[PDB]
């Protein structure tokens, strides 16, 4: 997990450098020199990323290898105007530029590690003995040769070819980096500074930029991996514009289809005395439990409100179990809506489900306003016994047991209650 | 770069497995057994991800460690119905299932590497000498002990406890994976089949899914790393919906948005016998004190003026104190508007607040025309005791204490009474 977190920290640092750079700056992700190679008009900036969240206090030995590699690169490329930066984070170190003294650099060159001595210290401090040079030139080194080289470099005083003073003064800088949370928070804040919204960056822009950095990091052919602020900004803007335009086009097409379907459905919904049955699959409508009672309430307010004119009672059939039906009945009772389910406990009753409600016109009273039950065989038999005028089907429920002869079947393709209300003319515009 | 590419390939394989799995499959990212642990009803699938783009041809030694680990895990969990799968990519190997023979497995167990012998071969092939067992049991092993163990395992023929034949026949399968580009294309195509378009996946769905997989991978807790196709689909859909919600607020400036909200609100306001409750924060409306009375007068003139038709009484709840309520009561009484507050001095009264007004249709008399009180706990309890058809919230007042179950909540974002009168269809043009 530590390696992945460090890679994420490095990628966020590269993204921050890209955002903070100007339009004339060429930045190479996973560059030849270091992790970040910011190429300006005349100065090339090399940044090496290190993550040390698990280290309580920063130590000189923790940065031996990056400093040695920077010194070797400077020795091999002294004629080039390259500034080397070491970006390392330590939890207990103040964020800012930390000075590295010449004595500290000399201490690095005195490290006892064989790998550093053989790779970087040997080129920085050439051995004065030809035997040591021949041993260092061997591709494969035995343990005795390693011990001999280590002892020689520990005991012998060797001059430094690399100009430590000039390197530290002009081409080296050490900065204590921010924490990962702080780093990517600052990166997002910079992403807002380009005209993007907070949640927009969090959902689209930041993941896209992270994926772009990760994709360019792994890929080897160094020429193509130089990036710029303008390219990333244009990529993000084009992605956002294309997504918004295609979403708008899809919405327009869906609205046209739904308007056509609504105009098809209107004529039969204006008759005041039609029996309408609804067979609904709860898993095809989003937020069914939270919005089902309100939908039935609106349907009764529009189509079953006038006591004298609305004489037929709607029926809703669900694909659920009996306990869900009991819960829905409880919620309807708590909202002063009178419905019948036909279930007494767990046993269905044919005579309690097909009965016609009583009306007292003077008191504006109807015994029950709707029938709500599940799609059991008994309920299907009851529906077949008393046929309806319209049979609205929502969700593609199996209707193989229904006697559909001479019955108007209307299939509704919806994904939420808003579209259902639109089709049934309960709203004017989505 | 190779390690990052391998990690990305593993993440893409995990995403592909999540997409290809059913809704009843539980998949653990960075699972206990292997990289991908797919838990079905009866069979657990363990997948190990390896990336070998830099290898020209597949070699048996390239898969020594994963196969040894799989054999050791099968030995530790022989009674469990776990199917082990090895997913490694080789550029010059045909994509598909590659059979591993028993002779190849025996060759793996004969590897001369000391790490494999000490870790997995020792447990798979126990040593018949107690000295070798004691050497293997040591936490720290000297070079001489390593040489002794290596020589003993190279020279001695040891029986295999693990049933190689049964493991290869039932619990093991080796598949040559696709390339990273082919894998990401297949993953995007799988995301396409979930109702998402190509550019939608390219911009939002794929980067968000990759970030989600990476975030779940680094979680130390194994339980928190368990994901499913339904959870990922819901997360992506929620992010996309939030994206539309945040983006669709710039083209329409103020008047188009207010017109849309008004058209949303008209159908419920056109009903003559609805109960409407308003919860208002005065600090969010300009000139509330000087304009509150005229607003209530206009609302009563439009929605509570017909005695025989308008039968329900509005309720205005304010975020103020009792003294301001008394001042407003004085001011209403001065203008001949009959309102009831429920306060006699300082004490609230339940039975006063929730009594229905009496009507004398012959004299066109209604006892009171509105309820205006503060948002104290007692008033909230009175509101909850008699639930309303429509609940309007102005200024974002806290509604945590209200019973919002099966109540139509409509949040109105305004800053003056002209906009409120426009939304409630008391003005035609602001």
């Amino acid at each position: 997990d530590h390696t992945i977190k460090g890679f994420l920290y490095q990628f966020n640092k590269t993204l921050n450098s890209i955002l903070s750079s100007t339009d004339q700056d060429e930045i190479q992700i996973e560059g030849i020199i270091e992790d970040i190679d910011i190429k300006n008009s005349n100065i090339t900036n090399a940044i090496q990323c290190k993550y040390h969240e698990s280290k309580v206090r920063h130590n000189l030995s923790d940065i031996y290898k990056p400093i040695l590699q920077m010194l070797l690169h400077f020795l091999e490329n002294d004629s080039l105007n390259i500034k080397y930066a070491l970006y390392a984070y330590f939890p207990n170190e103040q964020v800012g530029v930390k000075e590295v003294t010449k004595s500290q650099i000399e201490e690095i060159l005195s490290s006892s590690n064989f790998d550093y001595i053989s790779k970087y210290i040997s080129k920085i401090k050439p051995p004065k003995e030809q035997i040591i040079k021949e041993l260092l030139g061997k591709t494969s080194k035995t343990t005795e040769d390693k011990t001999r080289i280590k002892k020689y470099y520990e005991t012998s005083k060797l001059e430094t070819i690399v100009d430590i003073d000039k390197f530290l003064r002009d081409h080296f800088v050490f900065e204590i980096g921010l924490s990962y949370e702080e780093l990517m928070n600052e990166t997002k804040n910079l992403l807002m500074k380009e005209g993007f919204s907070l949640e927009d960056v969090k959902d689209l822009f930041y993941p896209n930029s992270i994926q772009y950095i990760a994709e360019l990091s792994i890929l080897p052919e160094a020429e193509k991996r130089i990036s710029s602020k303008n390219k990333l900004i244009d990529y993000l803007k084009g992605n956002k514009k294309t997504a918004m335009s295609r979403w708008t086009s899809e919405v327009l097409t869906r609205k046209q289809l739904l308007k056509v379907r609504k105009n098809q459905l209107v004529p039969s919904l204006n008759i005041n005395s039609r029996s309408r049955y609804f067979i609904i699959d709860p898993d095809t409508i989003d937020n069914f439990d939270d919005e089902f009672i309100l939908f039935v309430k609106d349907y009764l307010d529009k189509y079953n409100s006038k006591i004298k004119l609305h004489t037929e009672t709607p029926c809703f059939i669900l694909k659920t179990d009996v306990n869900n039906l009991s819960e829905y009945h409880k919620r309807f009772v708590s909202r002063n809506i009178q419905i019948i389910t036909g279930y007494i406990g767990d046993t269905f009753y044919f005579k309690e489900f097909n009965k016609e409600p009583k009306r007292i016109i003077k008191d504006n009273w109807v015994e029950f306003k709707a029938r709500i039950s599940c799609n059991s065989d008994e309920v299907i038999k009851c529906i077949n016994y008393k046929k309806c005028d319209d049979l609205y089907i929502v969700g593609g429920v199996d209707v193989s047991l229904l006697d559909t002869a001479d019955v108007n079947i209307e299939n509704l393709e919806i994904n939420n209650f808003r579209e259902l209300k639109y089709l049934l003319s309960m709203l004017k515009e989505i």
Side-chain angles (χ1 to χ4, degrees), chain A residues 203-352:
Chain A
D203 298 343
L204 182 81
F205 291 131
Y206 180 77
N208 270 317
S209 299
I210 291 298
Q211 187 67 28
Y212 180 77
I213 300 301
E215 284 176 2
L216 285 194
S217 293
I218 58 167
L219 290 181
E221 290 178 34
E223 290 190 347
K224 291 177 179 160
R225 284 85 170 93
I226 304 168
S227 195
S228 71
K229 185 176 177 175
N230 277 338
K231 288 176 180 175
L232 174 71
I233 289 283
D234 291 342
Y235 167 79
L236 296 176
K237 283 179 174 174
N239 290 358
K240 175 185 182 176
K241 183 182 180 181
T242 310
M244 183 278 288
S245 180
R246 168 188 60 264
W247 294 346
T248 314
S249 169
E250 291 173 0
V251 173
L252 296 180
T253 302
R254 180 82 169 174
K255 291 174 70 175
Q256 282 180 343
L257 294 174
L258 288 184
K259 184 178 184 293
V260 164
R261 190 64 167 122
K262 184 178 184 293
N263 275 356
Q264 290 189 354
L265 291 166
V266 176
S268 170
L269 284 165
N270 279 339
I271 311 173
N272 285 324
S273 296
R274 306 262 300 199
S275 65
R276 310 185 191 86
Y277 290 5
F278 291 85
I279 306 187
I280 316 175
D281 185 358
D283 291 331
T284 56
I285 298 182
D286 315 331
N287 296 115
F288 185 81
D289 292 276
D290 291 331
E291 295 165 3
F292 179 44
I293 317 301
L294 293 172
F295 169 77
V296 170
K297 193 173 174 295
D298 285 12
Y299 182 88
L300 301 183
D301 291 331
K302 184 178 184 293
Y303 293 105
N304 202 26
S305 62
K306 293 187 286 185
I307 186 158
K308 292 181 181 179
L309 301 174
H310 301 152
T311 53
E312 292 308 317
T313 296
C315 183
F316 303 88
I317 305 303
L318 308 183
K319 162 164 177 48
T320 51
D321 48 58
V322 192
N323 296 115
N324 292 333
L325 210 64
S326 301
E327 296 303 317
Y328 290 137
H329 193 193
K330 292 181 181 180
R331 291 171 70 192
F332 274 111
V333 169
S334 298
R335 181 66 178 171
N336 278 36
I337 291 174
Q338 285 291 135
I339 75 160
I340 66 171
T341 56
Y343 277 86
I344 309 281
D346 63 358
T347 310
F348 183 85
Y349 291 91
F350 179 105
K351 64 182 181 293
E352 277 299 298

